[PDB]
C-alpha cells in the first residue's frame, strides 16, 4: 500500500547499513557519505521482523530514531546531520517462541529498559485458548482458498483510500479550550497504574 | 398412608441421593470469595508442577 516503506530482517542488517554508510570511494579516494533504508523513507514508516536475530551494536545506533528522529554521524571528521521522520514499526519476537505463563512479563522478551523507553505505543497480541477462537478463523481460511478473488467485500476501495491521505495534512486541527483540565487528570490514573507494587513495576509511563 | 402398590419411581429416586458426587455439591452453598479462591489455586497449580 505505502510505497514510502522498506523491509529488512535481522541479520540483513548489520550496524549501518540502513542508517548512513560511509566508505571510500574507488574512482576518487575520497571519504563519502550514503544514505541508508531511514533517509529515502522519510515522512513513512520502516518495517523490522525478527527482533531477536541481532546483536547490540545496531540498537545503540538508532536509539536516536524514535526520540529525536534524526542521524548525526560524524565519522573521520567528515559531518553528515540529517533528519528523517520515519516511524519504527517493530515487531518483538519471545524468547522460547511463546509466552510463557509461569516467567514474569519481563522475562519472554530481549527489549530492556532504555529502549521501551524511547519507544512509544507498545502492544502484544492477545492469545485465547479457546474453542471458540479456532472456530471462527478456520472459516475465514476456507472462504478465502476457495472462493478466488471472491470474499473481498470492501465498502471502500483502495482507490479512495490513498486519495484521503492528503487532505489530513492540509488543515492542522487545534486544542480547545476545555480540553486542558482533562489531559491533567487521565494522567495521575496511569501513574498509579505503573507503580502496582510500591514504586516500579513493569512498563514504565 | 397414600401408596397401595408400588413402581418404577420410587426406587430411582433412592438410588441417586446415595450416589451424587459428594466432593462437588460442598461448593453451591457458597458466596463469591471463597468460590474464587478455590480457582485461584487452581491457575497456579499449571504454571507450579
Not at chain 1, 1 to 10: D, E, L, N
Not at chain 1, 81 to 94: D, F, G, K, M, V
Amino acid at each position: 500500500f505505502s510505497p514510502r516503506a522498506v523491509y529488512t530482517s535481522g541479520k540483513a542488517s548489520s550496524a549501518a547499513g540502513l542508517t548512513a554508510a560511509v566508505v571510500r570511494d574507488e574512482e576518487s579516494h575520497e571519504f563519502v557519505i550514503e544514505a541508508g533504508a531511514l533517509m529515502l523513507a522519510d515522512n513513512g514508516v520502516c518495517c523490522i521482523d525478527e527482533f531477536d536475530k541481532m546483536d547490540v551494536r545496531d540498537q545503540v545506533a538508532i536509539h536516536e530514531a524514535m526520540e529525536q528522529q534524526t542521524i548525526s554521524i560524524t565519522k573521520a571528521g567528515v559531518k553528515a546531520t540529517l533528519n528523517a521522520r520515519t516511524s519504527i514499526l517493530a515487531a518483538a519476537n519471545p524468547i522460547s517462541g511463546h509466552y510463557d505463563r509461569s516467567k514474569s512479563l519481563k522475562q519472554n522478551i530481549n527489549l530492556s529498559a532504555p529502549i521501551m523507553s524511547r519507544f512509544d505505543l507498545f502492544f502484544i497480541l492477545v492469545d485465547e485458548c479457546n474453542e471458540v477462537t479456532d472456530y471462527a478463523i478456520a472459516r475465514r481460511i476456507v472462504d478465502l482458498h476457495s472462493r478466488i478473488e471472491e470474499s473481498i467485500d470492501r465498502v471502500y476501495s483502495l482507490d479512495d483510500i490513498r486519495r484521503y491521505l492528503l487532505f489530513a495534512r492540509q488543515f492542522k486541527p487545534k486544542i480547545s479550550k476545555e480540553s486542558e483540565d482533562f489531559i491533567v487528570e487521565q494522567y495521575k490514573h496511569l501513574r498509579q497504574r505503573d507503580g502496582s507494587g510500591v514504586t516500579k513495576s513493569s512498563w514504565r509511563i | 398412608a397414600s401408596h397401595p402398590f408400588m413402581t418404577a419411581v420410587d426406587l430411582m429416586e433412592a438410588s441417586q441421593l446415595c450416589s451424587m458426587d459428594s466432593k462437588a455439591n460442598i461448593v453451591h452453598g457458597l458466596s463469591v470469595l471463597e468460590i474464587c479462591l478455590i480457582i485461584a489455586m487452581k491457575h497456579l497449580n499449571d504454571i507450579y508442577e
